[PDB]
Amino acid sequence: SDRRFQLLAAAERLFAERGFLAVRLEDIGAAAGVSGPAIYRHFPNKESLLVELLVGVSARLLAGARDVTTRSANLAAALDGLIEFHLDFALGEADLIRIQDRDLAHLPAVAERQVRKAQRQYVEVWVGVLRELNPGLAEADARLMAHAVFGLLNSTPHSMKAADSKPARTVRARAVLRAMTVAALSAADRCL
Amino acid sequence: DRRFQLLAAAERLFAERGFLAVRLEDIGAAAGVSGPAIYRHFPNKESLLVELLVGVSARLLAGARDVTTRSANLAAALDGLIEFHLDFALGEADLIRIQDRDLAHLPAVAERQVRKAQRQYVEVWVGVLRELNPGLAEADARLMAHAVFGLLNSTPHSMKKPARTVRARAVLRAMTVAALSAADRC
């Protein structure tokens, strides 16, 4: 059964810690508790794991952002939902942030284009909601604000190690990052 | 001066294509230096990456120290550190991309030097934030500093014009100052 899930979770942890190039498929097997030849029943190579991890996360973030905006009762609730969604992602998946930043170039060209397309469309969901909320907002300003918020929230791999896996650390980090994000978007809004 | 032309080409190409995909001859080509002439200046790609990253990490730390040296009080020191990092993020998007993506491609000795200078840069910010707010835990001050670097270092994604620079400076400064005030009151 979900030996497939155990291999993906090990690949995610090891790619984040050591980087894609330094990690061997059998290291992923080892960490998952899958014997060397058993690994190749699930994945042919390292590249196939990286493709699944990054094509996966980028498509799911885009789908999640669309779901948030679809289910939102008004535009203010849509922006609040997008902030809460990205916050949960940054605190819960710091490993996938680190990998998608540092190892995008190791994807096959087709997978790289898929990931960059899903990233661009995720940004467009935020830009669309920001401009609808602030009819004065230029495209270029909305893009600057959205990228600034992703930069703020996606800092979690630098700030959050094994240490802050305590639930009290997670909720404190979440509250501080949410307050920073909401204040940053308010200041941008009153400056344009 | 050919040494600077090779470094500037290496910076542009490493940012665009990533360290591994770039050849020394490509750097030579872009700089307008013939193949064998390159090796009078740099023995390999690695030596260019070392100079780029040892350089930027030492200059950021020295600039942060200069800001805290010249400041009459801690409020002025934080304002100065924000202005300094903003100038860096708007002027040096290529070095941000490289330092993020390609640190692991340094020789071990250079990697330790760059990670030490990065850690000491973060410690200048953390030191100022904790002196300003003695109630701030180490972990919270580190979270706030990395959040500000993430906000400011978003410039490669948002900035392909002088008019773009002026506008981005005003918006990113307002976002950063408001973010650090909200963190403090939380």
Automatic annotation (TrEMBL), chain B:
InterPro entries: Homeodomain-like_sf, HTH-type_TetR-like_transc_reg, HTH_TetR, KstR2_TetR_C, Tet_transcr_reg_TetR-rel_C_sf
HTH tetR-type domain residues: 1-60
Chain residues forming the annotated DNA-binding region: 23-42
GO molecular function, a single term: identical protein binding
Example GO BP: regulation of DNA-templated transcription
PROSITE patterns hit by this protein: HTH_TETR_2
Keywords: DNA-binding, Transcription, Transcription regulation
Source organism, top-level taxon: Bacteria
Subunit structure of this chain's protein: Homodimer.
Record-given protein name: Probable transcriptional regulatory protein (Probably TetR-family)
Organism: Mycobacterium tuberculosis (strain ATCC 25618 / H37Rv)
